[PDB]
Design a protein around this ligand. Structure first.
Ligand SMILES: Nc1nc2c(ncn2[C@@H]2O[C@H](COP(=O)(O)OP(=O)(O)CP(=O)(O)O)[C@@H](O)[C@H]2O)c(=O)[nH]1
Ligand SMILES: CN(C)Cc1[nH]c2ccccc2c1[C@H]1NC(=O)c2ccc(O)cc21
Ligand SMILES: [Mg+2]
Ligand SMILES: [Mg+2]
Length: 162
């Protein structure tokens, strides 16, 4: 079966761990346990083919270059009530682009915490950013599970079709 190396990147507290744990274990982590780094594996059927996902759940915090070289696709997560995390996406893409030496790297822009009210980043702002990069934009909630499978399986598809 085909193996996919996915990397979940993004600023502190955006929900990188909650999204990964929701896809792997089907439950929401309510507490905030800051991540050093964890990796999870899951065997799933995507478009009739059995896939092995190896997902790297990174720290929001120089030591990011090693996983960017190995990573095949990147879930670039920001929280829709965290303007700085959305702005930080530009820096993550520039670093990934530099390490991979390529303008066409599989990525999906994810606006997490879509269950929360009073958003500070509009969907239109994130759609415009994703359009400038040529990548999909998907909103998610690790709390309700909305869009979680869609975000990861859209990224698997982006890698498979690269
Ligand atoms: N309302 C809501 N809260 C969420 C959502 N996803 C994560 N959270 C909350 O945000 C906080 C941080 O989530 P966490 O998954 O640890 O984020 P992270 O980006 O992995 C944190 P670090 O960067 O330190 O690893 C937690 O309290 C968690 O429950 C979401 O979709 N909705
Ligand atoms: C092999 N797996 C059990 C772990 C794992 N899953 C991944 C998914 C995407 C990208 C990288 C990885 C890795 C590691 N392989 C690396 O090259 C690397 C660099 C820095 C790290 O922190 C971790 C890894
Ligand atoms: Mg985390
Ligand atoms: Mg504006």
């Amino acid at each position: 079966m085909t193996e996919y190396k996915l990397v979940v990147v993004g600023a502190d507290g955006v929900g990188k761990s909650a999204l990964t744990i929701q896809l792997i274990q089907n439950h929401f982590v309510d507490e905030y346990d800051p991540t050093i780094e964890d990796s999870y594996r899951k065997q799933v059927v995507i478009d009739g083919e059995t896939c092995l996902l190896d997902i790297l759940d990174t720290a929001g915090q120089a030591m990011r270059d090693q996983y960017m070289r190995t990573g095949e696709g990147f879930l670039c997560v920001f929280a829709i009530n965290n303007t700085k995390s959305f702005e930080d996406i530009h820096q993550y893409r520039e670093q990934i682009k530099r390490v991979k030496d390529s303008d066409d790297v599989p990525m999906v822009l994810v606006g997490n915490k879509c269950d929360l009210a009073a958003r500070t980043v509009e969907s239109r702002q994130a759609q415009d950013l994703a359009r400038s990069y040529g990548i999909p934009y998907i909103e998610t909630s690790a709390k309700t599970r909305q869009g979680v499978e869609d975000a990861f399986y859209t990224l698997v598809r982006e890698i498979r079709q690269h």
